[PDB]
Enzyme design. Structure first.
Site, PDB file in Angstrom:
ATOM      1  N   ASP A 487       0.869  -0.953   0.166  1.00  0.00           N
ATOM      2  CA  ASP A 487      -0.032   0.183  -0.232  1.00  0.00           C
ATOM      3  C   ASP A 487       0.775   1.065  -0.108  1.00  0.00           C
ATOM      4  OD1 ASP A 487      -1.757   2.210   1.210  1.00  0.00           O
ATOM      5  OD2 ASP A 487      -3.417   0.711   0.941  1.00  0.00           O
ATOM      6  N   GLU A 520       8.682  13.044  -6.151  1.00  0.00           N
ATOM      7  CA  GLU A 520       8.525  11.941  -7.039  1.00  0.00           C
ATOM      8  C   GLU A 520       7.801  10.672  -6.461  1.00  0.00           C
ATOM      9  OE1 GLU A 520      12.145   9.317  -7.684  1.00  0.00           O
ATOM     10  OE2 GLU A 520      13.155  11.118  -6.930  1.00  0.00           O
ATOM     11  N   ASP A 549      -3.143  -2.763  -4.546  1.00  0.00           N
ATOM     12  CA  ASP A 549      -4.627  -2.007  -5.022  1.00  0.00           C
ATOM     13  C   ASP A 549      -4.225  -0.820  -6.069  1.00  0.00           C
ATOM     14  OD1 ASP A 549      -6.985  -0.685  -5.112  1.00  0.00           O
ATOM     15  OD2 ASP A 549      -7.628  -1.901  -3.336  1.00  0.00           O
ATOM     16  N   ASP A 667      -2.557  -1.824   4.296  1.00  0.00           N
ATOM     17  CA  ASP A 667      -3.584  -0.857   4.195  1.00  0.00           C
ATOM     18  C   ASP A 667      -3.858  -0.389   5.766  1.00  0.00           C
ATOM     19  OD1 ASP A 667      -5.382   0.932   3.092  1.00  0.00           O
ATOM     20  OD2 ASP A 667      -6.934  -0.155   4.169  1.00  0.00           O
TER      21      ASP A 667
END
Ligand SMILES: [Mg+2]
Length: 692
Positions: A487, A520, A549, A667
């Site tokens: 994530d 970046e 994801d 997450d």
């Protein structure tokens, strides 16, 4: 072939697009006339239902022929839609339906206490076999009319619990943001924010008071994901989906918000019936059923034993004849140690002290008699029984801090149903961990009625997970040395997290990832470099599967091709999307199917309607080559097995997770860090899920 497989047929929200609405040919064009820097080429093609071929050659593809704001364009070639790659063809049919046939205004026409509920349709096109299907989804978006600052009872701590939630800045409910950080209250900045929006909207000073009310000076300075500008919680509103709400919340609501998948299907079919572009019948699809993969645990002689569910892991706490199960591994930091435990009881439930005491004692005394003469740690809560109020979390934290431990402690929090105020229990856990106290909260009302030992078993499962105890492993070993859940939340110091799982399904590392440099993005090639060079994970001569994801950018593909040959490793990536447009019109679970290259994953049983998980773009980087893999029964079984590696037994819908544990926990760590939870390097290295 499919003639020998155990298949179950089920309806999905895919409706066949009628012939007249499918373009016969695709047309290649380039901008022949001049364009300035403010032209915005991507927006220009997207409006006219097209797609960019090359940005430099200003070349694109349209699902229709144009016979001539739109500038002068040069025609290059025409091509039958049939010769176009299925993924490109789907998007061109969508653009045709959107731009030429105006599907969005026609869909709106068909669908035309302090919660404002709005309804909308979301659509996509999918090529399955030689046919195009429209994926039709009907969603409900609710907004809290009372602003974010008053809603969070004017408490900076409660605001942190909203990191990861969706918001709108009041005047514009069309822009949806995500809270990712907070900051100290400042009366100077509050004035500066107000002055900016007065200038943008050409407002009089009167307007601010009229719109937002009596302005709070000692208000926190919130920050968001997409824009570097400072936010004022008083000026924002919470926005969420009714189908994104937890099951517990849904129970109090009316039937329409807790509707079953079959009944949701009947509503979709009604929109399909009024829609001229599609056939009315939903697509019938064949689904595989996943195997109920067994788990391995140790017996009383420390020998592996097959278990099919964790529902009997701690049944030996109550039942004297129930088989005793021991963990595979306990971290060295807590191996056979007497953990200084605290018992935190909510002031509002003080009358039931006798029943509370007898429940905490009967559970821990039966656990401790077995934790003694084994690797498992013991819980010592003698004289550490304390009362607390949700109105003063800071008060009880000052009482605990007075005792300087500087070692791993535990706290069992006994609370009650306070609804929104339940976030104060999460505030307690977070602040407790800053003092090195790992904790778990439980609702007394539910635990009091637990005559079967079900909640006790789930509480102990979660406690083990929070203490990084590797209780159970997978019975089946995978080709993968590592399965890594990724994530990438952040433009900040720590931009992401990797949760590293081994071939047995146990957490080896909860690895925070620092962003490369200012200006970046945190891409997959950089994550790998970071894990090898700054995290000290050996990633050479390995078979590694990454779960994200998100999709891989074109620039990443070549870097991943080079990394595979540099590491002499097989690097795989699959996209796992919890938020998608698919719906399966069934109450059945532990099922999976493939629709036009997308995996439709429905793992867990749910009390109410449940949404499927979309699996997409399984890629393989090996020996400097890139290879696109077809989603199959093997990966779906592996992904299903990973939803079973759950220690969040007290949360969610049932026993197993909706999404695989590596990505699910990555997450959860990113959200925890956003709410300003402490990063404890030693604990994350040992896989302690202290933030759950
Ligand atoms: Mg129709």
């Amino acid at each position: 072939f499919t003639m020998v497989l155990n298949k179950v047929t089920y309806k999905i929200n895919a409706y066949k697009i009628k012939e007249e609405f499918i373009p016969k040919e695709v047309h290649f064009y380039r901008i022949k006339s001049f364009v300035n820097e403010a032209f915005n080429f991507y927006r220009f093609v997207n409006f006219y239902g097209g797609m960019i071929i090359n940005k430099k050659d200003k070349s694109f593809v349209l699902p229709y022929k144009v016979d001539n704001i739109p500038i002068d364009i040069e025609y290059i070639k025409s091509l039958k839609l049939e010769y176009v790659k299925p993924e490109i063809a789907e998007k061109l049919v969508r653009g045709y339906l959107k731009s030429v046939h105006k599907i969005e205004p026609e869909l709106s026409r068909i669908i035309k206490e302090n919660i404002k509920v709005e309804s909308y349709c979301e659509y996509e096109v999918k090529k399955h076999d030689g046919d195009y299907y429209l994926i039709l989804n009907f969603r409900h978006t609710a907004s809290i009319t009372k602003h974010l600052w008053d809603f969070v009872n004017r408490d900076k701590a409660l605001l942190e619990e909203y990191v990861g939630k969706k918001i709108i800045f009041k005047p514009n409910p069309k822009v949806r943001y995500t809270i990712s950080l907070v900051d100290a209250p400042n009366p100077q900045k509050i004035e500066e924010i107000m002055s900016h929006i007065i200038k943008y909207y050409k407002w009089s000073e009167d307007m601010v008071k009229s719109t937002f009310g009596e302005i709070d000076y000692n208000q926190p300075i919130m920050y968001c994901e997409e824009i570097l500008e400072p936010f004022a919680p008083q000026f924002c509103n919470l926005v969420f989906y009714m189908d994104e709400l937890d099951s517990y919340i849904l129970k109090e609501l009316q039937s329409y918000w807790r509707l079953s998948n079959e009944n949701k299907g009947k509503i979709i079919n009604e929109i399909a019936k009024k829609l001229r572009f599609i056939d009315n019948t939903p697509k019938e699809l064949e689904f595989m059923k996943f195997n109920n993969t067994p788990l391995l645990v140790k017996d009383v002689n420390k020998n592996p034993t097959k278990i099919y569910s964790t529902n009997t892991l701690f049944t030996w706490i109550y039942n004297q004849n129930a088989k005793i199960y021991l963990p595979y591994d306990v971290p060295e930091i807590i191996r056979n140690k007497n953990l200084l435990t605290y018992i935190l009881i909510d002031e509002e439930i003080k009358d039931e002290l006798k029943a509370i005491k007898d429940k905490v004692n009967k559970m821990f005394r039966n656990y401790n008699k077995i934790a003694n003469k084994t690797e498992l740690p013991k819980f010592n809560y003698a004289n550490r029984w304390k009362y607390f109020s949700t109105d003063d979390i800071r008060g009880i934290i000052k009482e605990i801090k007075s005792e300087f431990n500087d070692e791993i402690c535990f706290a069992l929090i006994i609370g009650k149903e306070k609804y929104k105020d339940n976030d104060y229990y999460e505030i307690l856990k977070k602040q407790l961990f800053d003092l090195k106290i790992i904790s778990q909260n439980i609702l007394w009302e539910n635990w009091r009625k637990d005559d079967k030992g079900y909640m006790t078993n789930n509480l102990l499962i979660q406690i083990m997970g929070k203490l990084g105890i590797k209780y159970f492993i997978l019975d089946s070993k995978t080709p993968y040395d590592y399965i890594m859940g990724l994530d990438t939340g952040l433009n900040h110091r720590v931009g992401g997290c990797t949760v590293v799982y081994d071939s047995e399904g146990k957490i080896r590392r909860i690895q925070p990832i620092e962003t490369p440099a200012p200006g970046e993005r945190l891409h997959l090639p950089y994550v790998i470099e970071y894990l090898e060079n700054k995290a000290n994970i050996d990633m050479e001569n390995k078979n590694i599967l990454f779960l994200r994801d998100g999709f891989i950018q074109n620039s990443e593909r070549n870097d991943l091709k080079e990394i595979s040959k540099e590491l002499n490793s097989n690097i795989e990536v699959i996209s796992i999307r919890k938020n998608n447009k698919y719906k399966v019109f069934t109450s059945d679970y532990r099922i999976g199917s493939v629709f036009g290259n997308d995996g439709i994953f429905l793992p867990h049983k749910t009390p109410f309607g449940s949404n499927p998980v979309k699996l997409s773009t399984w890629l393989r980087f090996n020996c400097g080559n890139e290879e696109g893999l077809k989603i199959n029964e093997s990966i779906m079984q592996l992904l299903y097995d990973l939803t079973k590696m759950n220690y969040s037994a007290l949360y969610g819908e049932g026993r197993y997770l909706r999404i695989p544990a590596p990505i699910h926990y990555a997450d959860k760590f990113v959200k925890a860090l956003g709410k300003n939870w402490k990063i404890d390097e030693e604990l994350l290295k040992h896989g302690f899920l202290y933030f759950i």
